[PDB]
Amino acid sequence: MREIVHLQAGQCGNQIGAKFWEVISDEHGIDPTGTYHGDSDLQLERINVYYNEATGGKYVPRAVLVDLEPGTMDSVRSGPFGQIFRPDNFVFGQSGAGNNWAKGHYTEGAELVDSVLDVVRKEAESCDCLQGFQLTHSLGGGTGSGMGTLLISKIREEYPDRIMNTFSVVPSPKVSDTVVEPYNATLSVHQLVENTDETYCIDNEALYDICFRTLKLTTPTYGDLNHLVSATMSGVTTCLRFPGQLNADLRKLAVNMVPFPRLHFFMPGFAPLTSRGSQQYRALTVPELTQQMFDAKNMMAACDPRHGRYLTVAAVFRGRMSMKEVDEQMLNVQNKNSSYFVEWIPNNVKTAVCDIPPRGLKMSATFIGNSTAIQELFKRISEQFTAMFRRKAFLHWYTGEGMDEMEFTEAESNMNDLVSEYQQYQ
Amino acid sequence: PRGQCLLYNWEEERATNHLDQVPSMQDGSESFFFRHGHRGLLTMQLKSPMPSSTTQKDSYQPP
Amino acid sequence: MRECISIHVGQAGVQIGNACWELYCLEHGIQPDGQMPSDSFNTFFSETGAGKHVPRAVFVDLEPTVIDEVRTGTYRQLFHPEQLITGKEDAANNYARGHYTIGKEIIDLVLDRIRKLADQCTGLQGFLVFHSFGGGTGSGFTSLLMERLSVDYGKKSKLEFSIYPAPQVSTAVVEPYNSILTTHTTLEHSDCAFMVDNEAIYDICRRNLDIERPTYTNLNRLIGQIVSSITASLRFDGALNVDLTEFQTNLVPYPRIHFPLATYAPVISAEKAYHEQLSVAEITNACFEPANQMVKCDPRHGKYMACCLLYRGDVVPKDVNAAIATIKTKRTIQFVDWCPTGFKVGINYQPPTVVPGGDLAKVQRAVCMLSNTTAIAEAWARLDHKFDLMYAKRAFVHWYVGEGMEEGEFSEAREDMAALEKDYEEVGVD
Amino acid sequence: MRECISIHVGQAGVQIGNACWELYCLEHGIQPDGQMPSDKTIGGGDDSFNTFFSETGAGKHVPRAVFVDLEPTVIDEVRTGTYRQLFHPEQLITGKEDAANNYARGHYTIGKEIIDLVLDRIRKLADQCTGLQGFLVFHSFGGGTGSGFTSLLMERLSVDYGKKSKLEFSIYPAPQVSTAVVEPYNSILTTHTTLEHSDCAFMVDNEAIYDICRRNLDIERPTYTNLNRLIGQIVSSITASLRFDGALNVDLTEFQTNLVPYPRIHFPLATYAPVISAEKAYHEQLSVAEITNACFEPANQMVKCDPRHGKYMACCLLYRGDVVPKDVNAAIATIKTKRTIQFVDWCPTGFKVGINYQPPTVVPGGDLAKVQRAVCMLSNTTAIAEAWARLDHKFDLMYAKRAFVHWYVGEGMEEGEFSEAREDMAALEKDYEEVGVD
Numbered sequence A: 001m002r003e004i005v006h007l008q009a010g011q012c013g014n015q016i017g018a019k020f021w022e023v024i025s026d027e028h029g030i031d032p033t034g035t036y037h038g039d040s041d042l043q044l045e046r047i048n049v050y051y052n053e054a055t056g057g058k059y060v061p062r063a064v065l066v067d068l069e070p071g072t073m074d075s076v077r078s079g080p081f082g083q084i085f086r087p088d089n090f091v092f093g094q095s096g097a098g099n100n101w102a103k104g105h106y107t108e109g110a111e112l113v114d115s116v117l118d119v120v121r122k123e124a125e126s127c128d129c130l131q132g133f134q135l136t137h138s139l140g141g142g143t144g145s146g147m148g149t150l151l152i153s154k155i156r157e158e159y160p161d162r163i164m165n166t167f168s169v170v171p172s173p174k175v176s177d178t179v180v181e182p183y184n185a186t187l188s189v190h191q192l193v194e195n196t197d198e199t200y201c202i203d204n205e206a207l208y209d210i211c212f213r214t215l216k217l218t219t220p221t222y223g224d225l226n227h228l229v230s231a232t233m234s235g236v237t238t239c240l241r242f243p244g245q246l247n248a249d250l251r252k253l254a255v256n257m258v259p260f261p262r263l264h265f266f267m268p269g270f271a272p273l274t275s276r277g278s279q280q281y282r283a284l285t286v287p288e289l290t291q292q293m294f295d296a297k298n299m300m301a302a303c304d305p306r307h308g309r310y311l312t313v314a315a316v317f318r319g320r321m322s323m324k325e326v327d328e329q330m331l332n333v334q335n336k337n338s339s340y341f342v343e344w345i346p347n348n349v350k351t352a353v354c355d356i357p358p359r360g361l362k363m364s365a366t367f368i369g370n371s372t373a374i375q376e377l378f379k380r381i382s383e384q385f386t387a388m389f390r391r392k393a394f395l396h397w398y399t400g401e402g403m404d405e406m407e408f409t410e411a412e413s414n415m416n417d418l419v420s421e422y423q424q425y426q
Numbered sequence B: 001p002r003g004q005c006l007l008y009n010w011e012e013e014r015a016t017n018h019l020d021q022v023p024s025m026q027d028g029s030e031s032f033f034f035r036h037g038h039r040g041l042l043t044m045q046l047k048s049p050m051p052s053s054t055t056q057k058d059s060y061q062p063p
Numbered sequence C: 001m002r003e004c005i006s007i008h009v010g011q012a013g014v015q016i017g018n019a020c021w022e023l024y025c026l027e028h029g030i031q032p033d034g035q036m037p038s039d040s041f042n043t044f045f046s047e048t049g050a051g052k053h054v055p056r057a058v059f060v061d062l063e064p065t066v067i068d069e070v071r072t073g074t075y076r077q078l079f080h081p082e083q084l085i086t087g088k089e090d091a092a093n094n095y096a097r098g099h100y101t102i103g104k105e106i107i108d109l110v111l112d113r114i115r116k117l118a119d120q121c122t123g124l125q126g127f128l129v130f131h132s133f134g135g136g137t138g139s140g141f142t143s144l145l146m147e148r149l150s151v152d153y154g155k156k157s158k159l160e161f162s163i164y165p166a167p168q169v170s171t172a173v174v175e176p177y178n179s180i181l182t183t184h185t186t187l188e189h190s191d192c193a194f195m196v197d198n199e200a201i202y203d204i205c206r207r208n209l210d211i212e213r214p215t216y217t218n219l220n221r222l223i224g225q226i227v228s229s230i231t232a233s234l235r236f237d238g239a240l241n242v243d244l245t246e247f248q249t250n251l252v253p254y255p256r257i258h259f260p261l262a263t264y265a266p267v268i269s270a271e272k273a274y275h276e277q278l279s280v281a282e283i284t285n286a287c288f289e290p291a292n293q294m295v296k297c298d299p300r301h302g303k304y305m306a307c308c309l310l311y312r313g314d315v316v317p318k319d320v321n322a323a324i325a326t327i328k329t330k331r332t333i334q335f336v337d338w339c340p341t342g343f344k345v346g347i348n349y350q351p352p353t354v355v356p357g358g359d360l361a362k363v364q365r366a367v368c369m370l371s372n373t374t375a376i377a378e379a380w381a382r383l384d385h386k387f388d389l390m391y392a393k394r395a396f397v398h399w400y401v402g403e404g405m406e407e408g409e410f411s412e413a414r415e416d417m418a419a420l421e422k423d424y425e426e427v428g429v430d
Numbered sequence D: 001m002r003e004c005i006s007i008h009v010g011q012a013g014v015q016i017g018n019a020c021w022e023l024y025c026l027e028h029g030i031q032p033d034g035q036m037p038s039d040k041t042i043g044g045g046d047d048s049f050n051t052f053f054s055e056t057g058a059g060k061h062v063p064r065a066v067f068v069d070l071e072p073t074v075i076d077e078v079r080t081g082t083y084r085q086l087f088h089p090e091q092l093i094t095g096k097e098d099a100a101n102n103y104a105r106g107h108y109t110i111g112k113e114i115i116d117l118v119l120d121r122i123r124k125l126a127d128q129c130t131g132l133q134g135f136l137v138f139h140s141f142g143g144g145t146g147s148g149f150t151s152l153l154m155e156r157l158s159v160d161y162g163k164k165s166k167l168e169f170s171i172y173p174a175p176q177v178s179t180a181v182v183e184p185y186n187s188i189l190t191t192h193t194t195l196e197h198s199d200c201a202f203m204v205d206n207e208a209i210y211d212i213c214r215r216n217l218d219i220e221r222p223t224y225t226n227l228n229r230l231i232g233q234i235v236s237s238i239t240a241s242l243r244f245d246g247a248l249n250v251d252l253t254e255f256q257t258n259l260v261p262y263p264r265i266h267f268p269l270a271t272y273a274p275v276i277s278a279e280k281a282y283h284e285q286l287s288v289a290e291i292t293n294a295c296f297e298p299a300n301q302m303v304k305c306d307p308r309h310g311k312y313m314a315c316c317l318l319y320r321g322d323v324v325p326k327d328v329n330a331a332i333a334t335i336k337t338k339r340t341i342q343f344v345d346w347c348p349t350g351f352k353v354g355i356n357y358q359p360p361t362v363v364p365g366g367d368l369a370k371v372q373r374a375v376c377m378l379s380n381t382t383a384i385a386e387a388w389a390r391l392d393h394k395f396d397l398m399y400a401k402r403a404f405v406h407w408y409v410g411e412g413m414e415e416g417e418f419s420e421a422r423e424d425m426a427a428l429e430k431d432y433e434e435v436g437v438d
């Protein structure tokens, strides 16, 4: 009745999607074989959102997994939950990307899109009423930033009256994994701004900081990192799958969080991230839950809200709770933070409540909020773009593939126009 | 085992000895075994049922 | 499935591949007979209906003194009868013989074998080349191969591993002529070229492995370890994968600059390996030490431009990032102002495999660095100081002028690489 | 809801609270695991354990105590021993290097690197408490951590919390014997801070308690576990009025008013009765009359001083168990009849009494007998003026030729602090004879 089509691109998208389809399989009670093994009856009233029905009572994800290299598809199907992904839903090329935006968007990504548009048109026309789309990828790579942004342009012009959400992995100065990643970031962000509705910037210093001082883990493997971002992604769309007192889907979240079409950059956060030895010793209550949420420690972007001003803030709640304690705490945090919120718009906080918490917990929350402080992420990319483009470093990998310097010249100018637009509303 | 000597966050190691020492050298390393993630994270009591307690179903019972 | 073709030219190339392919055999468990005793080897080994894994390599040399031992020894059955091309007469330390007269007779056969191996692969990644500048075959026939390969195959990746003549000691006298004359082709017909130095490997083996008196096999073990650590990503699963088209783009900023340096860590013996605590920071700061470099040049004088790091074993990205932050903190390592984010990192699960009778210890984690540095202009200048001295009195030039080439090619090969040095200093200007 | 916060500073403070919190668990029936026994679990609306334990929704009872020290060799066995699953993993704070009998290290150099974390812990425990009554602080005078850090702590709690009650339990460098050499310096330098920032401070001597354990309990070689049973018994007797019902209830802000006549005199003495063995309690009679005069005996006082030489100012009596108010009032007038016990003419009525219903509890492997009633004495006496003088006789002889002073002045303090800490006690001492003038 309201289906969500899931798009995974790149190596980073493949590992996040493997974790994401593991968590909501645990939430909906789906074994690695594909048969429902659960006890309650409310898990099947809304199961068609992510799972298509097949013979023998088997449920399969409505997701497509793409990458230019076949080296990561073998690891996807060799995972714990690699036996439920459809073999048709794997689209792979035979040549790499080389962390190049030009290779993945113009030369090698030109012929791999027509296969995946055929697959996604087959999937999208098979549902009764599609709620929207969803993509996770990485801007620091060649495939997710290159071919994924091609899928942004093609889908947005083929299905116009649909909602587009992206969980983008923004790059880092200190976790700089690629030499040429400022090129692959600016050329991805420029195509991303005009052709989406909701963006969620996930960055890796925040996940490394959370796994160090908040969870007290000594070996924060990517499986530990991906479980945090997958919990947020499952926490966004809880109202579509489970009932509650005040339901709010992705469209209702996007209306109240996006005042202007070029202001669509959020900055996520989660709730109870307590260490294993400290779980027994704390009282898990609503004021203790919302104390952690507004702090900058558990927040999943490498930006400080104290250096900026909030515009809109949303919180999605789970589990049985008193509505008065939600309204009193949101009013209290709005009154005490009279300087951290803008004054030209009242009631910047939105709330939503579901009744089903995740497994092993009793109530959780998800923080979705945009801020002016997200410009600190874009100022450091633009200044390192300008410092390197002036001496034409690594240019022959781009201008030798059919690209032109004018596309480089406009990309910085549109990105400078975006960071100039964020400043006026502070 | 792990965390015998009393330095470098020995409490969390001693509390989670029973959850991170399942392997018996058949596999290379802890990172190689937990490449998919640690078994107990963000919760405990790993086998716990879904509640069927809807607010409407609790409030409106047969009188 | 993604595979590459390895080509070994000259006596240095065949004796490097001779020790590299046995490490490739031991990494995948291939016995020297050529069969599995009981698909990650598809990058190097070709399947057969009888279960034989035939390597996809090319060996070429103009003399049979070295390849007949390959035709004789334990790896006789494993290697193909026609993947080992031998000539009739050696080039004998001359560029003109290897590039104009002797090298033209076997190049068609070599290209036929290359096409016969290239028709097998559904997807090809690139060509790795192993040769030495000082030898006549590795100077001339390599240049002919690099000229004739780019015409036949357009945009295939071309990686090189060069045995450079050392600035102090060498095994010939006329090798500056060959070193100048091969750059005039390999500057424009090559995507990337890594550099090694025999006396640097000598110093590393004498100071770290405690073997004060090494051998060519002892050097080739470390060289093959470098190549295995480079190509482990196409074979073994890991958290992050790199390709032959990845670090080429991440390390070549300009088409005229494709010369990085290679470094390995940890290099330690089995006797003292059990005492030192081998940590991620303690193995990644040894790569930045100038005394651990594999080329006799000091990076303190020069400036880094890009760096690529490859990790093998029980490595976690958190310690890697905490060590990159520490190595960015210090002033002793200097970076140019136009590359603020210069690091590439890749992670592989499999720890390195040791060889029976080998020198290296069995370690849990290893790291390899390929770093582009401006300090190779010093290495070019120290050989210019020899080339001018040799060419002033016009010594050893009569064989060159009588074997077919024109004397003006000497002046052209000096002038273009002088312009290349000017380009290096222009890039090095802040 | 009437709750108090207990903090244990120094090696002596955390060792007392190790043996004091096990007495709290057995009085309220809490297992060392941290939960009530399942055989007798029931819901009855009890708030007696709330004074010391915070309820968690899983049935776990977390104590509201903070353990702070600078060396890990005293905290880690609390973290390893039987009560490892009872204490909060972050309520107990360890340092890196000890103060090592240095007031300058515990107040200026090392103690300032932990004080921000400690007040953060105090703030978080205070945010949970709906209604707070006061702070109970446990330390010893002689040690560097117990002299410097609790002085730094006490001057930081007063600027944060304005008018909260501060109750202090201090262990004193014994007059004849000592486990340290420089501890006369640390005892002088800790009390110029606790004179002005402490509402009340109680007094415990190690060498005196040895004699009660040797004669009454008949333990010829006592150990630290034996001494801490008596120390934890007094605090349990003091705080019994908040937890348990009784005829007369005394609040933490009540006996502070009744025992502090002047702002410079806030040093009472503690006495417990009846302390007795299990064998000779069978022979003896232990009614109200013979337990209320045993606390008046100079040999049963836990501070080595003579009340015969001194003068009583105010007394507070706390009774537990099968005690009726009739014979207590009859026993008080018997005490006032005796001429050996002398009172100030400025205080005609110096007694305050309190009755509680629940008798004291014992511990397995304990030394005290299972008795029916007990009385705890909190008396303010002028006789402490001899106890300052006998340590001032040690201070001036040590300071005659500047022994051990170069490491105090090497950490960052000024040599004039010793002179200031001597003159104010000389002024403090003369305040005691001036109020002692009839």
Ligand SMILES: Nc1nc2c(ncn2[C@@H]2O[C@H](COP(=O)(O)OP(=O)(O)OP(=O)(O)O)[C@@H](O)[C@H]2O)c(=O)[nH]1
Binding pocket: C009, C010, C011, C012, C013, C015, C016, C062, C063, C090, C091, C092, C093, C094, C132, C134, C135, C136, C137, C138, C139, C163, C170, C171, C172, C198, C216, C217, C219, C220
């Ligand atoms: N590191 C290393 N270097 C080698 C090895 N074998 C040869 N070399 C180098 O090769 C140089 C000698 O030139 P060769 O490779 O033998 O000559 P060639 O390429 O066969 O050319 P011709 O002999 O004229 O046919 C020496 O200076 C060595 O530095 C080896 O096993 N390891």
Ligand SMILES: Nc1nc2c(ncn2[C@@H]2O[C@H](COP(=O)(O)OP(=O)(O)OP(=O)(O)O)[C@@H](O)[C@H]2O)c(=O)[nH]1
Binding pocket: D009, D010, D011, D012, D015, D016, D070, D071, D098, D099, D100, D101, D102, D140, D141, D142, D143, D144, D145, D146, D171, D172, D178, D179, D180, D206, D224, D225, D227, D228
């Ligand atoms: N009554 C009693 N006193 C104790 C006990 N443990 C230690 N003490 C006292 O503590 C003194 C020893 O110095 P401490 O106060 O413990 O030294 P500290 O607090 O650790 O200070 P630093 O050593 O600098 O860290 C002795 O004189 C004892 O009187 C105990 O269990 N019972």
Ligand SMILES: Nc1nc2c(ncn2[C@@H]2O[C@H](COP(=O)(O)OP(=O)(O)O)[C@@H](O)[C@H]2O)c(=O)[nH]1
Binding pocket: A009, A010, A011, A012, A015, A016, A067, A097, A099, A138, A140, A141, A142, A143, A144, A145, A169, A177, A204, A207, A222, A223, A225, A226
């Ligand atoms: N948080 C997280 N980040 C990842 C994961 N896998 C890869 N990445 C990030 O993805 C970036 C590399 O992207 P890349 O693989 O080159 O993208 P692709 O070429 O499109 O496949 C690095 O900066 C990594 O930090 C993961 O499992 N979790």
Ligand SMILES: [Mg+2]
Binding pocket: C010, C011, C061, C062, C063, C090, C091, C092, C135, C137
């Ligand atoms: Mg030869």
Ligand SMILES: [Mg+2]
Binding pocket: D010, D011, D069, D070, D071, D098, D143, D145
């Ligand atoms: Mg101590």
